[PDB]
């Protein structure tokens, strides 16, 4: 339950899902590029970007401004666990083949 992972940025977001900017400390384009592809194929998702402010320090902004219907964090949760399902499917296929050689 570490209170430092990501933070809702009140500066960027307005209200009610829609725009939400979540700066992930201690992470990189691995999770960003990996995740955006997942996120955008959730129907409600509209603008899911990310960037580092600068490689000169480790901080990672991720960005979702979407429609009404569901809520910002709900996307990141949903498609995030979807990215978990990715991981399982990956090891599912891969380790199957390799143990079967």
């Amino acid at each position: 339950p570490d209170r430092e992972k990501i933070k809702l940025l009140t500066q960027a977001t307005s209200e009610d899902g829609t725009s939400a900017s979540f700066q992930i400390v201690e992470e990189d384009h691995t999770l960003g590029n990996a995740l955006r592809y997942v996120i955008m194929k959730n129907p409600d998702v509209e603008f899911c970007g990310y960037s580092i402010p600068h490689p000169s320090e480790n901080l990672l902004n991720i960005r979702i401004q979407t429609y009404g219907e569901t809520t910002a964090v709900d996307a990141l949760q949903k498609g995030l666990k979807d990215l978990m399902d990715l991981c399982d499917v990956v090891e599912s296929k891969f380790t199957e083949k390799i143990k079967s050689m």
């Binding site: 990189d28 384009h29 691995t30 590029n33 490689p55």
Partner: protein, 350 residues
Amino acid sequence: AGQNATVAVMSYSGYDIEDALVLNKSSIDRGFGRCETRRKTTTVLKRYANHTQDIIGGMRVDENGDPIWQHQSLGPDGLGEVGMKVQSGQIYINKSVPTNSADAPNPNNVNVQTQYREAPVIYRGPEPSHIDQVMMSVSDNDQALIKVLLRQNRRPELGDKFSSRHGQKGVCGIIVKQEDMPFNDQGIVPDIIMNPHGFPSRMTVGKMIELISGKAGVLNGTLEYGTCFGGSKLEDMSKILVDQGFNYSGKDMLYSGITGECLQAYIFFGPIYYQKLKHMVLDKMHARARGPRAVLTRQPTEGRSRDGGLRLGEMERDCVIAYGASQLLLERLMISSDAFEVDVCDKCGL
């Protein structure tokens, strides 16, 4: 003098911009472009007309078993030794001279010919160095002479002049981690990654050929001749390259250091010989808060080294007047410059 370093001409990592090269970690980590920097500080030891030598005495060792940190920079000899990190503030030679050494000797002495004002010289600088070698030896006049050499290796930190040996004279830009900047097929990752815009206006295609020749020679397994109106010509390399599978144009696809997709234009990249220069930043970066003042003009001292202060020239100064800033002059040319109060007399002002 230099490295043979692989590069990809590209504007990647907009930290690049103008002439400013940019590098690869897990390469600098792998030993790319590293420099042992050696210096020496001699201290002459001469006898003084009082006939008392200038002495090396040292090794205090209070505290029950250790010499104080400031004085912990040695061993029982009383002088610097091999293989020690020395942080600035320490003693890399302890030189004790008699404070009466310059006095007028008389046809008498009794017991103490000591009276030493000891002036050991202190390593000063931002970053630890090493004493790996020292010399006690004599000059011609038969006097003790000590010479030590201090060294520190410099990982090529941000802001180092890197010549491309073809005329490209540039600073190392913001050091990339690893993944960022491309990799391509066999996964070969460029080391230096350099802006194209230098080539059009500086208008030098010689390097642009040199890269071709480089990717060639390795692939045939040769060094590559070139010389004025001579050396290996270009066309031959084409076949030389294509047979082994690289585009004769000397270009290839790469893949996004970040995104991991195809790069939207073929990139010209390969081997080029680079080199590292003097004017290492760590030498050059210079700053003060309140530094010494010179007795005659009572104000900051001259340039780098001794200590700081920087130059507002007239031609430099007056630029502020175009903005007409009253106080910026005062704080700048007065309150922070020479802080003084004259006392005068209304009647007959003096």
